[PDB]
């Protein structure tokens, strides 16, 4: 029972090359380079599902720090204030209020300064 | 083929009742007047092949 291996090899190669559309040059044409490109894209994608949590958090902290200094207190003192005021709003939402609702953020700063004093 | 016995091992080990192998002790062929009689008396009975070496012996003696 000789098994020719054309049809299944074609299917594997094609699977990998479909996962590499949009890559520059051989990275999207040649199998032997698109295999490495697809794997290295896999490793980066893993690594960056962790980094997007780190990057979004540092973005939010920069926005709360900006808006809170606009209301006359730093980020450090603001988070200490709200923790002592026993407010448990996470900082995705504090960043989002700090962009969209300036008056609510002003009131949060008043709770923070009220408890912090 | 059929497995050939390592033939000079069959002359030196002999199988026992629970699968172990007995052998004659070394050191009792010549130079003998220098040895104590306590050595020589303790080298006369036959002895079991130790745990380390049964692998080798079973490999050399596949029909015994």
């Amino acid at each position: 029972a000789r098994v020719k291996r054309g049809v299944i090899a074609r299917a594997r190669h094609k699977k990998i090359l479909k996962q590499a559309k949009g890559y520059y040059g051989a990275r999207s044409r040649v199998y032997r380079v698109a295999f490495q490109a697809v794997i290295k894209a896999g490793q980066y994608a893993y690594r960056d599902r962790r980094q997007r949590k780190r990057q979004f958090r540092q973005l939010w902290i920069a926005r709360i720090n900006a808006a809170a200094r606009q209301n006359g207190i730093s980020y450090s003192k603001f988070i200490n204030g709200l923790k002592k005021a026993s407010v448990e709003i996470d900082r995705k939402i504090l960043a989002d209020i700090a962009v969209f609702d300036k008056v609510a953020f002003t009131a949060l700063v008043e709770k923070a300064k009220a408890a912090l004093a | 083929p059929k497995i050939k016995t390592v033939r000079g091992a069959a002359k030196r080990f002999k199988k026992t009742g629970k699968g172990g192998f007995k052998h004659k002790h070394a050191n009792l062929r010549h130079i003998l007047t220098k040895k104590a009689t306590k050595r020589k008396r303790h080298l006369r009975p036959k002895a079991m092949v130790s745990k380390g070496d049964l692998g080798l012996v079973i490999a050399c003696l596949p029909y015994a």
Binding site: - | K24, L28, R29, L56
Partner: protein, 143 residues
């Protein structure tokens, strides 16, 4: 129903296929490690080879001799001799019952369990315990 028969559970184990991929477990080196004499095709040392140290089967002395006569002695239990078809036991009458072998010249009637019928043993050596066991269950031993 030939497409519904199926083997037992545990009887057909897979079979190691070496050299196929990373997932399989045995790819690249097939389970034989890095370089050396053992990772080589045909590679391996012979039996009883300890590096060059004098091997165990060759640093120990040789003893004994082979008898020539122990190859024609036999050893009859008492579980048989109810199998002899006759109630009389000689070397033939045992050979005829496929119980000793044709080349056998000497035989012996070791106590190895449970004679029942009265048996007349002729021309065979009998051990002590089995003389008592043959004579206890009826029986007769002449020589």
């Amino acid at each position: 129903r030939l497409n519904t028969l199926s083997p037992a559970e545990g009887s057909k184990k897979a079979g190691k296929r070496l050299g196929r991929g990373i997932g399989s477990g045995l790819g690249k080196t097939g389970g034989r490690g890095h370089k050396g004499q053992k990772s080589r095709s045909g590679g391996g040392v012979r039996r009883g080879f300890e590096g060059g140290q004098m091997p165990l089967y060759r640093r120990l002395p040789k003893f004994g001799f082979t008898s020539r006569k122990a190859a024609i002695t036999a050893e009859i239990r008492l579980s048989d001799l109810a199998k002899v078809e006759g109630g009389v036991v000689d070397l033939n009458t045992l050979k005829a019952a496929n119980i000793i072998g044709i080349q056998i010249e000497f035989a012996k009637v070791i106590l190895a369990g449970e004679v029942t019928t009265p048996v007349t043993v002729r021309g065979l050596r009998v051990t002590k315990g089995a003389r008592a066991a043959i004579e206890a269950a009826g029986g007769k031993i002449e020589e």
